[PDB]
Design a protein around this ligand. Structure first.
Ligand SMILES: CCCCCCCCCCCCCCCCCC(=O)OC[C@H](COP(=O)(O)OCCN)OC(=O)CCCCCCCCCCCCCCCCC
Ligand SMILES: CCCCCCCCCCCCCCCCCC(=O)OC[C@H](COP(=O)(O)OCCN)OC(=O)CCCCCCCCCCCCCCCCC
Ligand code: SF4
Ligand code: SF4
Ligand code: SF4
Lengths: 117, 53, 182, 186, 315, 49
């Protein structure tokens, strides 16, 4: 691994050096009150502009986590399949996926993504 | 077009279809997604100049 | 007014060189700084990125140039939407009072070296609406214009000819070579 | 073809009356289209094909054109075949100029001839409409064919009579050609 | 001997880094040319000899262009994200397969999942540093796109993983030694193109940077040098996926030029999409991610798991 | 000869204004059945691999 670690450190150092170098290569200009404003198509930005956090994107990412963990559970099936007892490996894995489908199809009839808002 | 009898037009009001077509957007665009709004502006085909002049 | 040389005069004359500075530099520093300017100008000249402001009527020609008849990316020109990544601004159409502060803001949000082409008569001097209560008479009164492309609108050939003229201006700009004197 | 859904009289064409069949061959066709993106494949192959069409880019400025004899471009004040100024200061060109981009002041030259002193055009106000030349009674001023007249400074665009005369001298041959082409036709 | 081993491992990593960077920077031209001919344009043929040095020209412009840093104190945080993104897009290469040992990198598929995952943090913090609602919407839309597709991406992998019988990528070569693997898993290839295209944020799934809906998405508030790094990072990404498509479906023949012919064709195919498809909506894509792909992947998982059970039965 | 823009002798051939689809290479039955055939042969080859 540490061969990988050192290479990444080397790259990152070379990366920052390049961007550090470009920071000196690019000519400077006297700062301007307006040059450093948020871009709002050329009309003054409104109040703070911090978006509302009343929304669903956490909800989708929570679906991600559930399936992301479930993915973790099924990752090792590749290797153990040669070793594990076949009934248990067969049925056990099959019901994983089956429950996933039924969760999905039950959830389509729920249709939770088609929120009213 | 209103002519007062001279060689110079007296009043020339111009009704461009894009005018009314765009006013309805405030109602047409209700609740659709942002991407839908942009596509709605396109299908309105409200070319400019004719709207404000 | 001057005029082109005649056939025999051309025969006597040598190659016109490539770097517009020439190759008469005296010392090593002069000669070196001449080349670095040439490289810089070559970079800024070959790749130039309009902002596509394009308010009106003129904008249609601003699109025809992107069209495949007088191809402009052929020359290394691309329409970046974001002004932070756009290097040039082709102000085209009329500048009404509601727009004046917007154009100003867009201009200076763009980082330099920034060049402006005033396309069309409406931008050049207010064009056909010059004596109007709502129009900025010209766009010289809001921003520093660099190249004027007369026309109403300019034929696409005229526009991209002006682009090449901007490339020539970008080619002859003296920044390192003459910093050395500064 | 499937039947319609609204019966149409003439003078019209409904663009959606065609029914989406429920025949099994018809549904399986659509299903197979979605399962293997046949329509995308058709469009995909189109663009591959259309690489093999030669691009229509003019190698400007070497290759260039085309225009037509009536093209409205750089302005020019012509001169008679003797070399005398054609303009007589009749001032119609100014009177018609929609943008009011023309300014004229005329007097008598010492010979007693009616001629201009100042004759100014602002090609930051001109719209290249050509009303001036359509009005001039002696073809004094014309929309010459040049269109690459691009300047780095705004002041350089306001032409006066000296600049306009120079363009006329410079472009006289081409302008003569066009007028010979269009005078009897205009 | 041993230190011979280490020295070469570092030379190869370094050598690959310069090549992949110069390739993608130089590849940008091939996008500009190729797209130029999809459209009836002629594409860049002006600078140098036939626009060959066009991308070097571009870099010179950018690095000369100043760095219009946003609001006063953001200097670092705005200067971090481009580094932390180009780093991922490069370093993801080191897991790529060789017969000529670069690494003994096992769990390569896992590492693929991990690097492809880390793109979310780069884009999100980049938008956050920018502090402009335009940039912020782009980041959120960008985040949602990537995060949603990873779910399908994982299960899609597993189908191949089972079909090869390990997580070591190299076994793709041994199992493809007779007949290519696309011709077995044709539908997966179309889905995998879409997944890969979604990851690199190209169109039809162009919401993250996009245009005409967000000015440039998260990219909108980026000056030159940062922008060049982001732009290079994306193209290092588009190449790598093209490589991964090649090593999975199309032979994995690392020591055969035809493999590199296949690299170009696939990367071309990405462009071939760029100039053809229109863009999706937000919601329609999420349907396509969960309601279409996840179902698809699970079926093949349940299909191939049985197949390999039957295969194991036979032998 | 002509002195003014007029249509030539015989008028002009009618301009085509009719849509025309391309060759419809496959149908739902053919497409799916061919897909399964390919997959089945693919399974066999993978077995031997
Ligand atoms: C190397 C390429 C440099 C690109 C960045 C740049 O433009 O630096 C310019 C600077 C001199 O340029 P200038 O601004 O004209 O003069 C100083 C003004 N007080 O460059 C310098 O002052 C140093 C150049 C050293 C040679
Ligand atoms: C040992 C090393 C010895 C060094 C030998 C010299 C190396 C440089 C060779 C190239 C120099 C070109 C000089 C002639 C020239 O100015 O060409 C300009 C060329 C074309 O640019 P353009 O004016 O737009 O014409 C386009 C025509 N279709 O555009 C260019 O070629 C300019 C860009 C060249 C990029 C190379 C930059 C110089 C340093 C080498 C890179 C490291
Ligand atoms: S200058 Fe002419 S073409 Fe341009 S916006 Fe004005 S009227 Fe239109
Ligand atoms: S219309 Fe012709 S002749 Fe009369 S003033 Fe104008 S240019 Fe001179
Ligand atoms: S072309 Fe039209 S606007 Fe221009 S000077 Fe002639 S009459 Fe005036």
């Amino acid at each position: 691994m540490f061969s990988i670690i050192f290479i990444a450190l080397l790259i990152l150092l070379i990366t920052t050096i390049v961007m550090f170098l470009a920071s000196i290569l690019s000519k400077k200009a006297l700062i301007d009150r307006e040059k450093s404003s948020p871009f709002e198509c050329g009309f003054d930005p409104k109040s703070s502009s911090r978006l509302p956090f009343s929304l669903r994107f956490f909800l989708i990412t929570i679906i991600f986590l559930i399936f992301d963990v479930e993915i973790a559970l099924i990752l090792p099936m590749i290797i153990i399949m040669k070793y594990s007892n076949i009934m248990i490996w067969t049925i056990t894995s099959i019901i994983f996926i089956l429950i996933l489908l039924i969760g999905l199809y039950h959830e389509w009839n729920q249709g939770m993504l088609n929120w009213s808002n | 077009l209103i002519s007062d009898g001279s060689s110079r037009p007296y009043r020339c009001k111009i009704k461009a279809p894009g005018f009314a077509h765009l006013a309805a957007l405030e109602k047409i665009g209700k609740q659709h997604m942002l991407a839908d709004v942009v596509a709605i502006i396109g299908t309105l085909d409200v070319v400019f100049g004719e709207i404000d002049r | 007014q001057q005029t082109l040389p005649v056939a025999e005069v051309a025969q006597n004359l040598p190659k016109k060189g490539y770097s517009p500075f020439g190759t008469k530099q005296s010392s090593v520093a002069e000669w070196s700084l001449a080349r670095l300017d040439d490289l810089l100008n070559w970079g800024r000249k070959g790749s130039i990125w309009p902002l596509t402001f394009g308010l009106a009527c003129c904008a249609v020609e601003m699109m025809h140039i992107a069209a495949p008849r007088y191809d402009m990316d052929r020359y290394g020109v691309v329409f970046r939407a974001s002004p932070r990544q756009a290097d040039v601004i082709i102000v085209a159409g009329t500048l009404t009072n509601k727009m004046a502060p917007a154009l100003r803001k867009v201009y200076d949000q763009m980082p330099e070296p920034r060049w402006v082409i005033s396309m069309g008569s409406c931008a050049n001097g207010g064009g056909y609406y010059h004596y109007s209560y709502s129009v900025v008479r010209g766009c010289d009164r809001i921003i520093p214009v660099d190249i004027y492309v007369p026309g109403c609108p300019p034929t696409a050939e005229a526009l991209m000819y002006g682009v090449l003229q901007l490339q020539k201006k970008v080619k002859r700009m003296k920044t390192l070579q003459m910093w050395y004197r500064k | 073809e499937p039947k319609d859904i609204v019966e149409v009289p003439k003078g019209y064409v409904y663009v959606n009356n065609k029914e989406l069949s429920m025949e099994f061959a018809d549904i399986t066709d659509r299903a197979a289209s979605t399962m293997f993106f046949g329509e995308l494949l058709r469009g995909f192959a189109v663009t591959l094909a259309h690489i093999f069409k030669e691009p229509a880019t003019i190698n400007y400025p070497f290759e260039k054109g085309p225009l037509s004899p009536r093209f409205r471009g750089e302005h020019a004040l012509r001169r008679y075949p003797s070399g005398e100024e054609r303009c007589i200061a009749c001032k119609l060109c100014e009177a018609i100029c929609p943008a009011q981009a023309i300014t004229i002041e005329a007097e008598e030259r010492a010979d007693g001839s009616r001629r201009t002193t100042r004759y100014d055009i602002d090609m930051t106000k001109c719209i290249y409409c050509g009303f001036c030349q359509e009005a001039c009674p002696v073809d004094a001023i014309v929309e010459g064919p040049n269109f690459e007249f691009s300047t780095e400074t705004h002041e350089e665009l306001l032409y006066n009579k000296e600049k306009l005369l120079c363009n006329g001298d410079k472009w006289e041959s081409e302008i003569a050609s066009n007028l010979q082409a269009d005078h009897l036709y205009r | 001997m041993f230190y011979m081993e280490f020295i070469l491992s570092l030379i190869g990593s370094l050598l690959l880094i310069i090549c992949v960077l110069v390739s993608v920077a130089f590849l940008t031209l091939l996008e500009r040319k190729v797209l130029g001919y999809i459209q009836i344009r002629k594409g860049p043929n002006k600078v140098g000899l036939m626009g060959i040095p066009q991308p070097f020209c571009d870099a010179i412009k950018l690095f000369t262009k100043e760095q219009t840093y946003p609001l006063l104190s953001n200097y670092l945080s705005y200067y971090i994200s481009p580094i932390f993104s180009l780093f991922l897009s490069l370093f993801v290469w080191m897991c790529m397969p060789f017969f000529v040992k670069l690494y003994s990198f096992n769990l390569g598929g896992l590492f693929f999942l991990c690097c492809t995952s880390l793109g979310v943090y780069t884009v999100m913090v980049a938008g956050w540093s920018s502090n402009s609602n335009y940039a912020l919407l782009g980041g959120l839309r960008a985040v949602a796109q990537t995060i949603s597709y990873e779910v399908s991406l994982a299960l899609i992998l597993l189908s191949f993983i089972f079909l090869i019988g390990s997580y070591n990528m190299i076994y793709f070569f041994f199992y493809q030694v007779y007949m290519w693997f696309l011709i077995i898993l044709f539908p997966m290839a179309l889905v995998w193109v879409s997944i890969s295209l979604a990851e690199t944020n190209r169109t039809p799934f162009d919401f993250a940077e996009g245009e005409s809906e967000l000015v440039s998405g998260f990219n909108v508030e980026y000056s030159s040098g940062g922008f060049a790094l982001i732009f290079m990072a994306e193209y290092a990404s588009i190449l790598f996926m093209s490589m991964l498509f090649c090593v999975i479906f199309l032979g994995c023949d690392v020591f055969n030029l035809l493999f590199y012919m296949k690299l170009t064709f696939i990367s071309f195919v990405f462009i071939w999409v760029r100039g053809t498809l229109p863009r999706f909506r937000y919601d329609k894509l999420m349907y396509l991610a969960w309601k279409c792909f996840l179902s698809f992947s699970l079926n093949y998982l349940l299909f191939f798991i049985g197949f390999k059970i039957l295969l194991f039965s036979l032998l | 000869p002509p002195k003014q823009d007029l249509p030539p002798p015989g008028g002009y051939k009618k301009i085509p204004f009719a849509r025309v689809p391309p060759k419809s290479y496959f149908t739902g039955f053919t497409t799916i059945g061919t897909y399964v055939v390919v997959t089945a042969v693919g399974l066999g080859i993978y077995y031997l691999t």
